[PDB]
Amino acid sequence: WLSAASFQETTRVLTDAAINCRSDKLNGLKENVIIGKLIPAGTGINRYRNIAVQPTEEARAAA
Amino acid sequence: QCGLPKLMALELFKPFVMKRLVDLNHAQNIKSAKRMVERQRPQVWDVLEEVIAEHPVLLNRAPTLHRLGIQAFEPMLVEGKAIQLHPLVCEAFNADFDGDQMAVHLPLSAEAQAEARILMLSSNNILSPASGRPLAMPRLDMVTGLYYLTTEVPGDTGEYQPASGDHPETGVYSSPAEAIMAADRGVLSVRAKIKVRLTQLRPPVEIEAELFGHSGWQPGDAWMAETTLGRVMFNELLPLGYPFVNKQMHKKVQAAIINDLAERYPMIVVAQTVDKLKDAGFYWATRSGVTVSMADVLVPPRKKEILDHYEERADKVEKQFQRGALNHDERNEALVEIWKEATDEVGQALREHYPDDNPIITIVDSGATGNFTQTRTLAGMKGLVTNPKGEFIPRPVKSSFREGLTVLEYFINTHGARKGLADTALRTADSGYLTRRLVDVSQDVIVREHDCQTERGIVVELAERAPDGTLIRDPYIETSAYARTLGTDAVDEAGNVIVERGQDLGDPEIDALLAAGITQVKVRSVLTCATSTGVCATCYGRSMATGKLVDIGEAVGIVAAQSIGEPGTQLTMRTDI
Amino acid sequence: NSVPGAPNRVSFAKLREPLEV
Amino acid sequence: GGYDTPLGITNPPIDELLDRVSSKYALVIYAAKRARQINDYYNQLGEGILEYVGPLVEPGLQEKPLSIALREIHADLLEHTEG
Amino acid sequence: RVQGPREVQIHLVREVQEVYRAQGVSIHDKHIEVIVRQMLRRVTIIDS
Amino acid sequence: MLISQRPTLSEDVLTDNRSQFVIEPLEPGFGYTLGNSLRRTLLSSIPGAAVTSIRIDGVLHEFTTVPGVKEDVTEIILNLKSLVVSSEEDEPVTMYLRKQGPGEVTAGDIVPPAGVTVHNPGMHIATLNDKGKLEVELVVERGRGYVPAVQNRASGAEIGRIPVDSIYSPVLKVTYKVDATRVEQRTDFDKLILDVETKNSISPRDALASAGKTLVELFGLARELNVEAEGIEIGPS
Amino acid sequence: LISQRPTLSEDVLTDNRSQFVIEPLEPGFGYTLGNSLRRTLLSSIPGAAVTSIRIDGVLHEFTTVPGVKEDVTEIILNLKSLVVSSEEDEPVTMYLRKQGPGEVTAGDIVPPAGVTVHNPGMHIATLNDKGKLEVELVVERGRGYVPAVQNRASGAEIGRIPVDSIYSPVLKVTYKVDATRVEQRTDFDKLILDVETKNSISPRDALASAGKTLVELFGLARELN
Amino acid sequence: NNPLSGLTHKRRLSALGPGGLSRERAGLEVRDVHPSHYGRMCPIETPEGPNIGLIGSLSVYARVNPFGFIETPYRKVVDGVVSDEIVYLTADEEDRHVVAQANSPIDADGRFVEPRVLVRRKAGEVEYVPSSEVDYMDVSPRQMVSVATAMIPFLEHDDANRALMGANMQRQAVPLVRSEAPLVGTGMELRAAIDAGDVVVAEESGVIEEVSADYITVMHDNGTRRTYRMRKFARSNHGTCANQCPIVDAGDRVEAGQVIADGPCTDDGEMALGKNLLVAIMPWEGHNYEDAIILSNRLVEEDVLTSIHIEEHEIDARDTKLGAEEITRDIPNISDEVLADLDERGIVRIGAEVRDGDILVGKVTPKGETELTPEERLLRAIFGEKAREVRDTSLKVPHGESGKVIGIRVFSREDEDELPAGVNELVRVYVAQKRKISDGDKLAGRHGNKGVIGKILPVEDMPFLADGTPVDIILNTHGVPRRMNIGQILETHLGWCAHSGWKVDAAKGVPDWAARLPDELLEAQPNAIVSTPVFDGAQEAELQGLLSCTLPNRDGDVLVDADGKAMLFDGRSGEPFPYPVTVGYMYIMKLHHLVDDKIHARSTGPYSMITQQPLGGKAQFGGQRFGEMECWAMQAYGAAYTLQELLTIKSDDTVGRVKVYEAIVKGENIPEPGIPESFKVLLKELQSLCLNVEVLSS
Ligand SMILES: [Mg+2]
Ligand SMILES: [Zn+2]
C-alpha cells in the first residue's frame, strides 16, 4: 500500500488500506527508497551485498 | 573527463581538503582550517588538486528522461565559473549551450565512488539502453567535418590518371607519409582519387581474401589501395584490426561502424576511438568551408513559372467556387491539394537547381542537421500555413524567408508558430505524467534468476516470403527480432539445425537464418517467463546498454519505462483515430 | 527625423508614414 | 591487448577487470570492500594490526583506496565467495 | 476476450510501436513487452 | 628577462627510427608558434638525396610491364622511390644492378661506387623469373624538400628515362599536438609534443638538432637588427 | 631549386608602418614564418603603460569630480589610450596640474626624466571655472597586458585606483606571400610582412625584440645535439 | 535593467490576476493569436515560459478607447483614392469594413496598379479584392508590431519563433559603460529612447549656460534658467548601473524636445543595447559547437563588454530585551587586516574593497547567556581573554560577490526619521564591481541567436582578414539554416556595408537596383549609420548592389567580394583557409544571465524546521534538489548504495550527517546510513491523523 499511497489518490488508498489492516511487506523498490533501506535491485540484492573479500593466500605470503 | 570551476570544487570538497591540509600541516588545527579555506589563501589550491585525483563526480541536467541522464566523470580543475562539458555526451543529457544549467553531485562512500567509477562512468555507457544504437555518436560539427574529409570529388587536383607514351600515371604514392607531405604543398588535394600502398591498415574483406589468402594479417604485408588520402587519415583513426572502409561518411554509416565496433571490440577501445573521431571531426570542420551567406541561399529560376501556373489553377477553381457548383469545402480542399502539389514541384525544382556541394546541401545530406523541407522554407516558398483551429488557409504563402514576407503573411505564419509553441509545453508535461505512471506500474519487474527453462515463447514474422519468390527482409527486425533468445531450435525442412535454442540471435545469426530460407522462429521473451517474481535473464535476452546478456539484478522495469517515456516530446499528431 | 537632436539615420523606407507614433 | 595505454580514471581497463568477476555489480562490491579493508589497515598501522593486510601491490604517492583496490583486482590477488 | 491473451499482446505492441515509429523513433519491442506483461498480471473472478 | 621555468626536452625512443619530443613547460601561446615552425622546418629544410629519373633495359614505349620479369612497372618504380641513399656529392650519379636467371631482386645487388651508399640492401625490388634478364639504371641527386617529377629535357637522347617523384627530406612524417597541462598553477604553460619518423640512414635526434640549428641560423638574420635588444633568456643546461 | 641564404630588406611607408621582406624562402614556409613572427610580435613585445591613478578629490573610481564635465570612469577610459615609453624597470610616478576652464591633454602632463608621452595632442577631459584636477599617475614597464591588481593585495593607499594595463607598442600587423611555382622547380617564397606600432617604438625595434625572443626560444631546441 | 525593459513593462497586456484566468485555467484557445489581434496586440512580444500566450504587449500605434476597448487607427480609401483622414476603429468595427495592405502600390493619387489587392476581410480571411471595393488601408507597416520587437532589422526574414525569442532577450540586455549606437537599426530606436523617460529631455528651448558631470543649467530664452540635476551610478531595481552622461557643450543652443544627457543604454539620444563586432560565421575547432560563442580577449582589454553592478545590503538595528544594537567597532575576537578598511563609526570607509566573508557593518548585540562550555572557562585563563558578553551579529559579505563601496545611507531615530516601530537604526551600504566578460556569460544578437561564451582566447588565435584586422566574434554555421533566422546574415552584410561605406557609380545611368533605392543612399561614409524598418526595408537586390560597391578603408583592398564572403587566414596554423567565410558587423548585447549570479556550491548548510532537509536557493546556502525522476535513473543503473547515501546521510539523517562529517575529517571509513528522520516525521503525521501505523520487526 505504500507505493499506491505515494502514487495517486493518497486519501482513498490510505482509507481502504486502514480498513483492511493491510500490512505492507516493505519489499518493493519504492518502499525501500522511502524507508532508506537498500533497494532490491542492482547492488542491493543478497548475492552481491553479502560478498566476502579476502586476499589470496599467495598474496598474503608476499607480505 | 569533465570541467569543474575552481571555487565550486573548493566548496564541494571542503572536509576532504581540511583533513588533507591539516595532514600536510597547512593549519595546525581544523578551527584554523576553517579560516584557512574560507579566506582562500593560495596554499588551498594545490592541496585541493591533490584530492581530486581519481575521485569521480556525478553530473545531472534536469529533466532526466532516460537512464543516461546521470553520468559520472573524473573532474579536472578548470579556471572560470562554468562546467566544461564534453561535446559528445550532449545527446545523453539532451544538453545544449543556450544557457542551460547542470547540477553536480559528489559521491561520498567508498561503495558510491566504486559505482560512479564502474556503472556511471561516461565511457562505460555508450550504447543507448532504449534501442541499442550508439548514443555517443559524432554530432553536427564533427559529422560535417568527416563528411567533408571522406567525400570524393572527381576532377580534383593531383588525381590519378592512367597514361603511357610520354609520362606514367603520376597518381600513385608510396606511403601515406609521402601523401601528406605532398598535401602540405599544393600539388595534391585531400579529396582527390589516388592510389597508395598501405601497410598499417587492414584491406577490405574481399581484397584480403583474394590476395592475402587465409593468413590476412595486415601490418606486415603491403597492399595497394585506390582511394583518397583523406579516407586514409579517417581509417587511421579506427583500431588496427578494423578493415578499410573507403566509403563516404554519413550519419548512418558512422552509426553502423560504431555499432560494429561496440559489438566486436572492448569498451575502452571504442571509448578511445570515438574521442579520436571527435578530435578529427572538429579539426576538419573548420577547413570544410561550410558557411552560410546570401550567395549560398539560391532561389529557383523556375519558381515564377510554377507559381503562376498553380495560381492560374487556383483562379480557375475560385471562379468555379463563385459559380456555386462546388461548395466552400470543395474550394478549400481543391486549393489545398493544388498548393501542396505546387510546393512539391517547387521543392523538387529546388533540389535539381542546388549544386551538390552547396553549404546547406552538404549540411542536409550529411545528416548533421535539418531537413529539405526546412531548406524549401528558407529559399523558395514555405507551403501551407495553418490556422489556430488546425485547418489550412486557402490562400497560402508564396515568398520565402530569404525573399522576405509582408505583414499579413507574417501574421498567418505567427498563427502556426504560436500554436506549436503552446502545444509543446503541454505535451512535455503530459509525457512527464506518462513516465511517472509507467515507472510506478513497472517498478517490481527485476531480473531474479538466470533461466526458468520454460519452453513457451512468442513468434516474430521475420521477413515473410514474396509472391515472386525471394526472402524480402522485414523492415522491422532490429526492434523485433534482434537481441533475443530462441525458444526452440531453428531447423529448415527438417534438416540441419541452423541455430540451436538459447542463442543471442545477433546479426550473423539472423543472416544465417535468412540464408537458410527460414522465416518463422520462436522467441523466448518475457511474456512467457515462468519465474514467479521478476523475469529470468534468458527470457529478457540481450541488454542493449551493455550489448551482452542482461545481468542478474538489473532493474529492467525502470529502464523499460524510461525508454518508452523518453521520446514523449517528439510525438506529434497528424492533420476519429 | 523631425526631432531636434536626431542623428541623421538614412533609411531604406519606400513610403512615408501619414502619422508619427 | 593492442589497445593504447589508458589515462586518468580508467588506468585499469574495465574489461580486463570484468573478466575477473562474474558480473559488474560483483566487481563493484569487490572494489568497495577491498577499499574498506585498505582504509582499515591504514588506520590500524600505528595501533594493533587486525587480520587486514594493506596494499598487496606497491602503492603510489597518495592514491584513494579504491584505485589500489582495482589495481589489486587487476593482479588477481583476491578471491571472493558469491552470496 | 475473443482472441485470448496471446493476440492482444501482439496487437498492443504493434500499435504502440507504429505510433512511436511514425516519427522515426526506434524502441525495441521488449521494452513495451515488459509493460504489457505487467497489465496482464490479474484475472477477474466470475464465480463465488 | 626569464620565463621563470626552464623548458625541457624529453625524447622517448619508440622504434629504431621513431621518437617523441616534448617541450615542457612553455610560455603561453607559444606552443603553436614553435610546433608549426618546427614541423615545416623538419619537412623542408634537412638536406638529403633521392632518386630522380629511371631508365631500364628493354623499355622505350612500354610503360606497363617489362619482359624477363613478370610483375608490372608501377611496383618497381614505387619500390625504387622508397629507397634511402646518402650522397656527399651534388652531381647526379648513375646506378646499376644486374643478375642472371630467375631469382630475388634486392638492393644489395646494386653497384654503388664511392660517394654514395644505400642503407636498405635487404629490400625486395622485383622477382626475376623465366630465365629473365634486367638492367636497371638509376639517377640520384641530393638537395632538400619535396619536389615532384621533373620532365626529361633530353627526351630524344634519353627515351628510356622516366621522371619520378623524389623524397629529399630524410624525415618521413611529423605530427604535433598541444595541450593545456598545469596551466593554472604555472601561468598557462603548455606542453608541445612532436612525433618524428625518418629514414634509417639518419636518426630523429640529430634530424631535429639540424632543423633547429638551421632555424636559429636563418632567424639570427632577423635578430641582426639590434644586437643588444630586450627579450627573454632560458638559463643553464 | 635555390641554394641562396635568406636575406631581410626594409621598406618604410610612414613613421609607424613598415614593410619587411625576407627572400628567398622555401615553398610553403612563408605562411608559417609570418604567423610565427606575428603572434610573438603582437603578444610578446615589452612595453610601458600606466597602472594606477590617484585623484585628490575622489576616494574611488565611481564618483564624479566637482567641475569636470566627464565622469571619473571617462577619464580612466581616456587615459587608457595614452602612449608612454620608459627605460627603467623600476616604477615611476607622473603628475597632472590643470586649473580653470579649458581642455586638458596629455601635453599638460609633466613627465619626469626617462618618460616621454608620444601623444600629447590627445585630450583627457574638459574643465570649467570650478575645474580642480589633481591627478596622479604611475607607470611601470612590462609585457602583454595585466588586469587591474587589487589595491588591497599590495600595500596601497585607500585612494589608489588600479587601472587595467596593456603593454603593447604594436597596433596592427599583417603578412602576405607570393610564391613563384616555376615549372623548372625554381621555387621560393617571398614573405612581405607589415608592422604598425603605436608611436612608442619603431617597427624595426619591435621586430628586433621579437626576433631575439624567437632566437632564444629556438636555440632552446638547438642545444639537443 | 535597460530602458527597453522599462518601456515594455508598461504598455503590456496581462491575462492573470483577480478576475482573470490562471495558467492551469488557460486552455489552448486563449493562448492562440486571434486574427482580431492585427494592429491591436502584437503577436510576437510574449514570454516563452509557461505564461506563453497570456501576457502580451500593446502595439506601437494602438490606443485605448474610452470604454476600455483597444482601438487602432487606419487610413480610409475611396474610389481608389486614399485620403489623409485618419479614423480610429475598434476590433468589431473592422468587421463591417475592409482593410488593405500596409505596403500597397500607391500611385501618388491613391489608386493601386492592380485591382485585386491583398486585404483582410471581416472573419480574418485574407483574399484579393478589386481596388474600387476596398474602403480602408493600414496606416503604415509595423502596425501589427510592438515597440520591443520593432527594433529587429530584417524582421520579415526571421521566423516567428526566433523573432519572438529575440524580442524577449531585447528586454534582458544590461547597460554597458559605452553603449555604442548600432550600425544598423530601425527608426523606432530614437523614439523609444526619448519616451523611456531616463534620457533627460530639454523641456524648454534656450542656450546652455553651463554644463558639468553632476549638473546642467540651461539658459532659457526669457530671463529665467533651468537646472537639471543628474543621476550618477544610481542602483536600479535589478542591480544595474544608471549612469547619465551629458552630451551637450558649453555654449550650443538647444531646442525644446532635444536630448540633453544619454541614459544607461543610449548614445546621442537613440537606443544602444550592445556593440558592433566583427563576425565570422564559420565553425572553429568546436569551441563554438552547439550555439557556443568565442570572443576575443580584446573585448576584455578594451572594456568593450563590461557592466557595472550596484548591490545594496541592508542592516536593521532594532530594539530587543537585550537592550539595543550599537553600530560600533567593539566586535569580539577580530583581527586587524580585516578591520583596517572599516571606519571608527561602525561602517566601511567609502572606497574600500571587500570580498566574501569580510566584515561590513559592525552591529554588536548582547549575547545573552547559554551553557558556556567548561572548556571556555579553562581557555580564558591561558590568554587572559575577557568574557566578551556580546554576540558579533555583524554584516558578512555573502559568497560570490566583491567590489568597491559606493556610499553610506544611514538612518537613525536620533536623526529623527520615520523608521519602523522598535527599529532604531537603518543602514544601507552599496557595493559595486566592474564585471568583465568571461566564459559562461550569455550573449545574443537581435535575431534570437543565443549562447554562452565558449572561450575567451587571445587575439593571435583568431581568423583575420588580409587587412590584418583580427575578427571579433565567431558564430557557428549550423545554427543558421536549422533555425530559420536567415535575417542575421542579412544584418551582418548590411553592417559591413555601413562600416565600409559605398559610392554607387551612377555615372552611366542609375543602376536598376538603385532606381527604387532612394537618394542620399548611393553615397555613404565609413562607419555611417543606416536604418531599416521591419517590414518596409532594404531588399535583397539592394543588398547585392551595396555589396558590389564596397570602397576600401585606407589601401586598395576589397576584402569582402561581391557574393559576401571574405578571405581569412588562420591565426594558429597560419595557412589561409581553403574557402572564403562571410564577415561583417552584427549587434551583440550582454544578457542579464551572468555566470557569477548563477554559480552555487554547498558542503553543509542549514536545514528546515519540519524536515531536516537542506534549504533551497542562492539566498540561503541552498543545496540541489534530487527529484524522484533522478531517483528513477539512480535505480536504472542499479547503484543502490549511492541512492541510499543521497537519500539518508547527505539529506536527512542528522546523526548520520554529523557522523559522516566526523568521518571525512578523521580520515575514517564512512559508517552505515541510519534511519531517515523525514520518514519518522511522516510516520508521526500518520499516527496523529488517527491512523494506527506500526512497523513490525518480525
Ligand atoms: Mg538549451
Ligand atoms: Zn521465462
Domain with residue G199: its CATH number is 3.30.1360.10
* Number of alpha carbons in the 13 Å side-chain half-sphere of residue B495: 7
Q: Please, what sign has the CA dihedral across residues B62, B67, B72, B73?
A: negative
Q: Which residues pair with F161 in a beta bridge?
A: F55
Which ligand has the nearest atom to the CA of B102?
1
Query: H59 exposed, middle or buried (CB, 10 Å; 0-12, 13-18, 19+)?
Result: buried
Which ligand has the nearest atom to the CA of H452?
1
Based on the domain organization, do F183 and F133 belong to the same domain?
no
Chain-chain contact of C12 with H190 (C-beta, under 8 angstroms): no
Which ligand has the nearest atom to the CA of B90?
1
Q: How far apart are CA F113 and CA G202, in angstroms?
A: 57
**In 3D, which of H72, H13, H2, H16 has the Cα closest to residue H43?**
H13
Which subunits sit against A, judged by 3+ Cβ pairs under 8 A?
B, D, H
Residues of A within 8 A of D25 (CB-CB) are 42-43, 45, 48
Query: F48 exposed, middle or buried (CB, 10 Å; 0-12, 13-18, 19+)?
Result: buried
**In 3D, which of D7, D71, D12, D9 has the Cα closest to residue D38?**
D71
Residues near H286 by Cβ (< 8 Å), separated by ≥ 6? Answer: B87, B141, B142, B278, B282, B285
Q: How far apart are CA F205 and CA F196, in angstroms?
A: 9
β-pairing, B172-173 vs B194-198, is parallel
**In 3D, which of H59, H54, H69 has the Cα closest to residue H17?**
H54
Based on the domain organization, do G180 and G162 belong to the same domain?
no
Q: How far apart are CA H255 and CA C5, in angstroms?
A: 8
Q: Please, what sign has the CA dihedral across residues B112, B114, B115, B116?
A: positive
DSSP tag of B212:
I
Task: Give the DSSP H or E segment for D25.
Answer: helix D24-43
Q: How far apart are CA C10 and CA B479, in angstroms?
A: 62
Considering only the beta carbons, identify the residue of H84, H191, H258 that sits closest to C4: H258
Q: How far apart are CA H4 and CA H173, in angstroms?
A: 9
Which subunits sit against F, judged by 3+ Cβ pairs under 8 A?
B, G, H
- Cα F153 from chain centre: 26
Q: How far apart are CA E10 and CA H236, in angstroms?
A: 64
Q: How far apart are CA H34 and CA H123, in angstroms?
A: 10
The domain boundary residue, chosen from F145, F168, F191: F168
Q: Rounded to 5 degrees, what angle do the CA atoms B139, B142, B144 make?
A: 100
Task: Kindly list the distances between the CA atom of residue G100 and the CA atoms of G57, G128, H252, H619, in Å, as whole numbers in the listed order.
Answer: 15, 6, 20, 50
- Cα H273 from chain centre: 9
Residues near H458 by Cβ (< 8 Å), separated by ≥ 6? Answer: F29, G43, H296, H297
B207, B227 contact by CB (below 8 A) = no
H551 phi, psi to nearest 5 deg: -40, 135
Which position has the grid cell 541499442? B132
Which subunits sit against G, judged by 3+ Cβ pairs under 8 A?
B, F, H
F196, F209 contact by CB (below 8 A) = no
β-pairing, F8-15 vs H266-267, is unpaired
Query: B7 exposed, middle or buried (CB, 10 Å; 0-12, 13-18, 19+)?
Result: middle
User: Which chain H residue has its CA at the smallest distance from C21's CA?
Assistant: H61
For residue H162, the CA-to-ligand 1 centroid distance in Å is 14
G40, F30 contact by CB (below 8 A) = yes
F9, F140 contact by CB (below 8 A) = no
Q: How far apart are CA G26 and CA F43, in angstroms?
A: 11
Q: How far apart are CA H226 and CA H219, in angstroms?
A: 7
Residues of A within 8 A of B111 (CB-CB) are 43
Tell me which amino acid residue F15 is.
T
Residues of H with CB under 8 A from a CB of G: 177-178, 210-214, 232-233, 243, 245-246, 250, 300-301, 303, 308, 341, 349-353, 404-406, 432, 436, 458-460, 464, 466-469, 569-576
Q: How far apart are CA F64 and CA H98, in angstroms?
A: 84
Residues of F within 8 A of H458 (CB-CB) are 29
Q: Which residues surround ligand 1, an ion (CB under 5 A)?
A: B 96, 98, 100
Chain-chain contact of E35 with B540 (C-beta, under 8 angstroms): no
**Residue G46 cell numbers, joined:** 615589452
Q: Rounded to 5 degrees, what angle do the CA atoms H503, H504, H509 make?
A: 145
Which position has the grid cell 617604438? G201
Instruction: Find the domain containing F226 and state its range.
Output: 1-47+169-237
Task: Give the DSSP H or E segment for H5.
Answer: helix H3-9
Based on the domain organization, do F58 and F5 belong to the same domain?
no
**Residue B243 cell numbers, joined:** 578493415
- Cα G85 from chain centre: 9
* Number of alpha carbons in the 13 Å side-chain half-sphere of residue H667: 18
3-state DSSP percent of chain C in helix, strand and coil, to 5? 0, 10, 90
Chain-chain contact of B526 with E33 (C-beta, under 8 angstroms): yes
Task: Kindly list the distances between the CA atom of residue B276 and the CA atoms of B121, B280, F166, G73, H415, in Å, as whole numbers in the listed order.
Answer: 18, 6, 32, 49, 71
Count the Cβ atoms, other than its own, within 10 Å of residue B330. 13
**In 3D, which of B411, F134, A18 has the Cα closest to residue H126?**
B411
Which position has the grid cell 636497371? F136
Count the Cβ atoms, other than its own, within 10 Å of residue H373. 9
B528 phi, psi to nearest 5 deg: -125, 20
**Residue H451 cell numbers, joined:** 549562447
Resolution value (Å, 1 decimal)? 3.7
Q: Which residues pair with B408 in a beta bridge?
A: none
Binding residue per annotation — B452?
yes
Based on the domain organization, do G52 and G163 belong to the same domain?
yes
Q: How far apart are CA G36 and CA F40, in angstroms?
A: 12
**In 3D, which of D23, D12, D24 has the Cα closest to residue D77?**
D12
**In 3D, which of H576, H579, H582 has the Cα closest to residue H563?**
H582
Identify the experimental approach.
cryo-EM
- Cα H16 from chain centre: 24
User: Which chain G residue has its CA at the smallest distance from B183's CA?
Assistant: G28
Task: Kindly list the distances between the CA atom of residue H622 and the CA atoms of B82, B408, F69, H607, in Å, as whole numbers in the listed order.
Answer: 18, 49, 84, 9
B6 phi, psi to nearest 5 deg: -65, -45
Based on the domain organization, do G25 and G60 belong to the same domain?
no
- Which one is the CATH code of B141-286: 3.30.910.10, 3.40.50.800, 1.10.274.100, 3.90.1150.10? 1.10.274.100
Q: Rounded to 5 degrees, what angle do the CA atoms H191, H196, H202 make?
A: 75
**In 3D, which of B479, B505, B542, B547 has the Cα closest to residue B261?**
B547
Class level of CATH domain B294-422: mainly alpha
β-pairing, G165-167 vs H215-220, is unpaired
Q: Would you call B493 an interface residue with chain G, using a CB distance cutoff of 8 Å?
A: no
Chain-chain contact of F29 with H458 (C-beta, under 8 angstroms): yes
Task: Kindly list the distances between the CA atom of residue E43 and the CA atoms of F48, H486, H592, in Å, as whole numbers in the listed order.
Answer: 88, 60, 59
Q: Based on the structure, what is the number of domains in chain G?
A: 2
b/e per residue C1-21 (b: at least 16 CB within 10 A): eebebbeebbbbbeeebeeeb
B414 phi, psi to nearest 5 deg: -60, -35
Q: How far apart are CA H44 and CA H39, in angstroms?
A: 12
Task: Kindly list the distances between the CA atom of residue B471 and the CA atoms of B497, B520, H15, in Å, as whole numbers in the listed order.
Answer: 19, 12, 62
The answer, yes or no, to whether B and F have at least 3 beta-carbon pairs within 8 Å is yes
Query: H473 exposed, middle or buried (CB, 10 Å; 0-12, 13-18, 19+)?
Result: buried
**In 3D, which of H362, H208, G209, G104 has the Cα closest to residue H217?**
H208
Based on the domain organization, do G102 and G156 belong to the same domain?
yes
Q: How many residues does chain H have?
A: 698
**In 3D, which of G145, F213, D9 has the Cα closest to residue H299?**
G145
Considering only the beta carbons, identify the residue of B133, B561, B572 that sits closest to E26: B133
User: Which chain G residue has its CA at the smallest distance from F37's CA?
Assistant: G32
3-state DSSP percent of chain D in helix, strand and coil, to 5? 50, 5, 45
Q: Which residues pair with H404 in a beta bridge?
A: H432
Task: Kindly list the distances between the CA atom of residue H367 and the CA atoms of A45, H335, H364, in Å, as whole numbers in the listed order.
Answer: 53, 20, 9
Q: Which residues pair with H531 in a beta bridge?
A: C11, H185
Chains A, B: CB contacts within 8 A come to: 31
**In 3D, which of F190, F25, F47, F174 has the Cα closest to residue G220?**
F25
B503, B486 contact by CB (below 8 A) = yes
Q: How many residues does chain C have?
A: 21
Count the Cβ atoms, other than its own, within 10 Å of residue H548. 16
Q: How far apart are CA B49 and CA B205, in angstroms?
A: 49
Q: How far apart are CA G151 and CA G154, in angstroms?
A: 6
Q: How far apart are CA B252 and CA E26, in angstroms?
A: 14
Instruction: Find the domain containing D82 and state its range.
Output: 1-83
Chain-chain contact of D25 with H638 (C-beta, under 8 angstroms): yes
Q: How far apart are CA H61 and CA H74, in angstroms?
A: 10
Q: How far apart are CA H275 and CA H181, in angstroms?
A: 7
Q: How far apart are CA H58 and CA H41, in angstroms?
A: 5
Based on the domain organization, do G25 and G102 belong to the same domain?
no
Query: Helix G29-43 crosses helix G203-222 at what angle (to 10 degrees)?
Result: 110
Q: How far apart are CA G167 and CA G86, in angstroms?
A: 11
Chain-chain contact of C17 with H140 (C-beta, under 8 angstroms): yes
Which residues 64-83 of G are in CB contact (within 8 Å) with F?
Answer: none
Chain-chain contact of G172 with H353 (C-beta, under 8 angstroms): no
Task: Kindly list the distances between the CA atom of residue H275 and the CA atoms of G166, H150, H278, H475, H492, in Å, as whole numbers in the listed order.
Answer: 22, 18, 10, 16, 13
Task: Kindly list the distances between the CA atom of residue F191 and the CA atoms of F163, G41, H396, in Å, as whole numbers in the listed order.
Answer: 43, 21, 43
Separation of first and last alpha carbons in chain D: 32
Count the Cβ atoms, other than its own, within 10 Å of residue B213. 9
Q: Would you call F160 an interface residue with chain G, using a CB distance cutoff of 8 Å?
A: no
Distance from CA of B112 to the nearest CA of D (A): 8
Considering only the beta carbons, identify the residue of A33, A37, A43 that sits closest to H639: A43
**Residue B126 cell numbers, joined:** 555508450
**Residue G108 cell numbers, joined:** 599638460
Which position has the grid cell 583496490? D69
**In 3D, which of E43, B221, B187 has the Cα closest to residue G183?**
B187
Task: Give the DSSP H or E segment for G40.
Answer: helix G29-43
H351, G59 contact by CB (below 8 A) = yes
Count the Cβ atoms, other than its own, within 10 Å of residue H185. 25
Mark out the alpha helices in B97-228 (DSSP H runs).
Answer: 110-118, 140-150, 176-184, 205-207
The answer, yes or no, to whether B and E have at least 3 beta-carbon pairs within 8 Å is yes
CATH number at residue G55: 2.170.120.12
Q: Based on the structure, what is the number of domains in chain D?
A: 1
Query: Helix B176-184 crosses helix B229-237 at what angle (to 10 degrees)?
Result: 120
Residues of D within 8 A of A61 (CB-CB) are none
Q: Is F167 helix (H, G, I), strand (E, B) or coil?
A: strand
Based on the domain organization, do G158 and G51 belong to the same domain?
yes
In chain E, which residues are followed by a C-to-N distance beyond 2.5 Å, i.e. a gap?
none
Based on the domain organization, do G121 and G194 belong to the same domain?
no
Residues of B within 8 A of E31 (CB-CB) are 130, 559-560, 563-564
The answer, yes or no, to whether A and B have at least 3 beta-carbon pairs within 8 Å is yes
Considering only the beta carbons, identify the residue of D2, D8, D66 that sits closest to B110: D66
Q: How far apart are CA B198 and CA B196, in angstroms?
A: 6
**Residue H443 cell numbers, joined:** 550573449
In terms of phi and psi (left: phi > 0; alpha: psi -120 to 50; beta: otherwise), the region of B222 is beta
Separation of first and last alpha carbons in chain E: 20
Q: Is H677 helix (H, G, I), strand (E, B) or coil?
A: helix
Based on the domain organization, do G106 and G208 belong to the same domain?
no
Based on the domain organization, do G182 and G211 belong to the same domain?
yes
Q: Would you call G145 an interface residue with chain H, using a CB distance cutoff of 8 Å?
A: yes
Based on the domain organization, do F164 and F60 belong to the same domain?
yes
Mark out the alpha helices in H610-676 (DSSP H runs).
Answer: 628-637, 640-648, 654-666
Q: Would you call A17 an interface residue with chain H, using a CB distance cutoff of 8 Å?
A: no
